[PDB]
Amino acid sequence: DEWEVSREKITLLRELGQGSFGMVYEGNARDIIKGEAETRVAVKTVNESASLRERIEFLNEASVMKGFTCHHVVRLLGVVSKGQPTLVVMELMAHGDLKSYLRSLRPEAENNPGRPPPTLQEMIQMAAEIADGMAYLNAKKFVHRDLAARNCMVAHDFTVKIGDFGMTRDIYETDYYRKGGKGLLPVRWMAPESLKDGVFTTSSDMWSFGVVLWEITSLAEQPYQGLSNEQVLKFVMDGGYLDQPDNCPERVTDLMRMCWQFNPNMRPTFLEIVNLLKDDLHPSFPEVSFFHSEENK
């Protein structure tokens, strides 16, 4: 493997928190990034008591990430696959997941880091970054299936990136992934047709993107508060959607509404979102984005 890292190069420092299939650690990795003798990293592991399905999914997720190179997607740095346990080493996102980050910015949050909530400009920047990462994933012919603030990560410089590919599926041959039946599923983020027909497409990721905008503007309130999981399933299939957060900027409300068109064919594409926002972004954006890259063809 070009991805293999010697185990002795990794040192675990502390627990970051439970991942999909086991604990994630903050660690040091020696000689993993050219130009750095030692780099602080995130290291994902599988739980000792993980089911066979979970063990398979953990390895599949690492494999998927090997194919990705995008500034707005969290980078896989290496795998320790010699001996045991398997360590999956990724780019450390200094400000954690976006759901946790947004919740910390609430005026009354105990962990308010002493910084103001996102400005409109900052919310637009976040939106464009998330949409750019998603545009990349779509161009690579994957559907994410779990787009949500908790699965976006925030870097040292506050750049947002797509993380957590635990539900991501290849759609190269057909442009959709179908899985009917019972599951432990992110019901509050799922599109009506996913709920009804078990179908997942870039359009259903777009529905979730709308919910991410709602999270950003509500500082990650719980969607459909007061509704149970089963009530949400009914409500959304029947044409229900979320109300606008208090003081939600109108530019963002307009976008959410478009993401929540009942007919998936009427929703925007991720490329359309970046394009809508392209003139309201940091000067570095065209230097790093998938949208502005030669790859976007």
Binding site: A42, D97, K182, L184, V187, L195, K196, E230
Partner: peptide, 14 residues
Amino acid sequence: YNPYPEDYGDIEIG
């Protein structure tokens, strides 16, 4: 890297 287990529910789709 917080888990939000409550963000998932056992439901049937399809």
